Structure formats: C-alpha cells, structure tokens
Point group: C2
Chain length 281, copies 2
C-alpha cells in the first residue's frame, strides 16, 4: 500500500520550475496523482549572506514536515512515495523512514549530491542531501527529525553518476561509498551492474531516490540542471524491477522534475510511468 | 497616505530570488516593511509547451489579485507602494489604478519591457508588462482586471533604458512611446531631461515603476537580470523628487530586487531609502 506525497519546493536547486512538478502532474495524469498529499512550504527567516547554504532554514523546516509525515506513513504500514520538487526533499524522507527502519538506498542520479558548504560551488542544497544523511555538512540539517546521521555509508549505492567535482570527490572518498558510474552501464551493461548491486548492497529494506537528471537529456529534457549522456527508459525500468524483486522497498523519491524545461510531457510521462510501476510492481 | 504591498513571485523573470525580495526586507528593515500586506502565488494550470508566454495563467492570477487590491487601495485614498518581485506585477498594479483614473506611467528601467510573444527571446512575462498595459501581446493578459488596454501610449515615458533587442525595438517604434535613455540623461543632464519630461507628460496623475536593474550593477548587484552601466543614487532620487513635486503620484512599484545576488545588503538599503522616500515625499 503506497501513499503519494508531493513537495512543492525548489529552494535546493534555486532554479525556477521543479516546484511546479507536483501540481503539474496532478493535472497531467489525474488518475495517477490526483489524491496526492501536498506539503505546504513555510518560508523561514534566512541569512542571505550565506551563499554556500542557501535557504538552510526553509529547506530544513520543509524536510522536517516531510520527515514527520513520511514517518507516520511508514508507521501505518504504507510505502511513502515523494514527488518533488528538487532532491533536497530526500533529506526529510530518508530521515522519516530511518527512524522506523534502518535502510539502504539506491541513489539514482547524475551527481553524487554529496556536497558540503566547503565543497559546493553553488550553495544549492539539492546537491548536498546524501552527505547530510551521512552526517556530513551542517549540523542542524544533519539533525533533521532526530539527531545523528540517518544512513550507514556502507548501505549506499550511487547509480548513474556522470559528473563529479574534485571537492565533492574528496567528501566521497572519505566515506568509501560505492559509485556505479553510467560508464559502467555503458561498458558492462545494466544487468551485470544490477548484479553488482545485488552483490554489494545486502540490507533488505531499501529506499530508492530518483533524480530525473540521471536520464539522457534527450529523453528527460525537463530538469533544471541537465547532464548529458544518461540512462534510457529501458535501463531505468529494469533497475526498478530488480529493486522491487531483490529487496523490500520501504519508500521512494522521484525528484527534480522541472516542467518548465520539459518538451511535451516526455519527462512528465517518464515520471508517470515510474510512479505507475511503483504502484503495481 | 500609504499602503505597502509585497508580491512574492518570480514567474515573470523565471529566476530564483525576487520572490523573496519582500521577505528579505521585512527581515532586514522591519521598522519599515514588517507590517507589509503580502500576495502569494496561487499556482495555476499552465501550457508548458507555450515557451514564449511562460506561466501565463499563474502570473495572470497573481496580477488579478494585485489589481483588485491596488484598486481598493486607490479607492480608499491610499498610495499603494508595491514591493516585489519581478516586473510583471506592474501589469496588475497599473490596471488597478487605471480603472479609477486615466493615469500616466514613469517607467524607470534598463529595459523597455514592451515585448510580445513573437518578439520575446525568453518567454519571460516580466519583459512584457508595458506592452500588455497598452494592449500588446496575449489578449488574456491584456484583459487583466478589465478588458482592453490600460494606458495611452502618449502618457508613458521609459526612463533609463540601455538594452533593447531589435524585435522589441520594433514594437516600441510603432507605438511612438517616448524613451529617455540613460545616455540621454547623461548628454543633456538629469535636470534637462526631467524638464523635457515635464514638457512632454502633462497628465495630472502619475504611476512610477522602478526596475532595480536600472541601477548600475556596482551600486545594485541585487537583480535577477543585471544591465551594465546604469543609474546613480542621486540621479534616481532627483527623478523621484521631481516626480512627486510636479505630478500627483497615484501609486508606485519597486521590482526585481534579488536578495540572492545582492552583496552586503547594498541593494536592500537602496530599496529601503526609495520606499521610505515614497512614504514621506
């Protein structure tokens, strides 16, 4: 039993469009998204001198609302499926679930999203969530919902990375996290690499955090930040099938759907199909 | 008599920052802005395939709310000072005053903001408000609040412009609107160009509308679309006092302040001084 929860924010990516993702879908595919529960962003007082931690307090308050409702959904025995909204929302969701169940995570994205104020070149919190869930970054953000890291570095697999800066690379090496590059899917194949996932990540309870930027921008144009050379539809849905079969999927996130840059709902249809397979795997 | 109304939107400029303009002013200058009335964005179904008129219905509903409030304000005898927020809010403000009084517009800006869906190179409705106020562009946006154009092209003066794409310049030329370019203020002098304005505009009802990008970026970095080589502080304030002395100011707009691009709160201090003068001119 799944519950759909839309988050209408873009204060992580700080680029116009992805905050319209949830409302856009309610109208594009009502039969799928019509009853989704929408979370109300409450703007919080900020310090705009801080350009390496933009909208810290608001992103944090929103992730707290996310975590609380997601935790209530897990306690009721439902699978929360979060429709964003930029990737920062994951900070909330992963925090609301980890309280009730220690989880692994398949982080499907073109970026590691493991930046810190010291490594970020943008100050965007859409590219810091994983690091913060591993106890790296701002302490108030790390302490969302409950104090302390929310994931074990060993229970994380970053799937489909294509771009990684040196300063973020140093945060990555310090955690020993496993990163499947998209060049791995290109050279070895999606099935061999999915087998590698079965080999490495072994906890049964699994969270799936999807960044729409993992796709090839020709298939998923509607993302505030496109990274060229990404996954196809087939590879993505093979990954989803493998995940739902070889694990117990606790929750999921589909993030960074920017309807403004989309071309005829192609990306919106990608998200529709992802949610529809999640609803009846 | 005054009423300060902030509009937390950026769906005209489609760049993140100006929607938090009013916010950053309630925080940074509370004794000036903390009792400001606010207008939020009620998101609306869009045609994200129409990329020359981005967020049409949302920006239109925002401006309709602005229009009702501004009309009620002028009706009550208040001079609405509308803080923002990108420039599209002007569309809703002017209309509100135009239902009661035939008024002129002192359009202080670095751009003419007279674009139309066929001339725009961005689809950003913040560069189309003046045109639509004279009846140019999308019909539904022209018909905001009440049907038909809201301004007589003869009763308008663009002031301080320096960047006009050719296809916007064509619209401007066919309308015959008077354009005081910044270099005009320089060659003749602020006093002389202001005397020219006195001579040209004779309507006894003026609405000022400021785009913070009219200022020089080195004086006001806090803007979404910076335009280089702009106005001074005393130049703008000379113009302000001229306007309040020689006409009856019916309403005013200060738009496109971006707290994310600002540096050490300079631009917010500029907005503070401008608003404080407009409250006791």
């Amino acid at each position: 039993k799944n519950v759909l929860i839309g988050v209408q924010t873009n204060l992580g990516v700080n680029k116009t469009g992805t905050e319209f993702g949830p409302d856009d879908l309610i109208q594009a595919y009502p039969d799928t998204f019509d009853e989704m529960e929408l979370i109300s962003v409450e703007r919080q007082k900020e310090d705009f001198n801080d350009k390496k931690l933009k909208f810290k307090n608001t992103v944090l308050d929103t992730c707290e609302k996310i975590a609380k409702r997601v935790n209530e959904a897990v306690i009721d025995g439902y699978r929360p499926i979060l429709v964003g909204g930029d990737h920062s929302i994951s900070l909330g969701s992963v925090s609301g679930v980890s309280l009730e169940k220690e989880i692994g995570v398949l982080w499907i994205s073109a970026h590691g999203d493991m930046n810190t104020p010291e490594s970020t070149l943008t100050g965007n919190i859409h590219g810091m969530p994983l690091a913060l869930l591993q106890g790296l970054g701002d302490r108030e953000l790390v302490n969302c919902f409950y104090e302390g890291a929310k994931l074990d570095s060993r229970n994380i697999v970053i799937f489909g990375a294509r771009e990684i800066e040196v300063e973020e690379r140093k945060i990555i090496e310090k955690t020993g996290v496993k990163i499947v590059y998209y060049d791995d899917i290109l050279r070895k194949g999606i099935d061999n690499v999915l087998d590698e996932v079965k080999d490495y990540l072994k906890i049964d309870n699994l969270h799936i955090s999807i960044d729409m930027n993992v796709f090839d921008p020709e298939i998923a144009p509607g993302v505030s930040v496109p990274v060229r050379r990404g996954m196809s539809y087939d590879e993505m849905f093979k990954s989803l099938k493998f995940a739902f079969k070889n694990y117990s999927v606790t929750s999921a996130d589909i993030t960074e759907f920017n309807p403004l840059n989309d071309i005829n709902g192609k990306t919106a249809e990608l998200v529709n199909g992802i949610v529809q397979y999640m609803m009846n795997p």
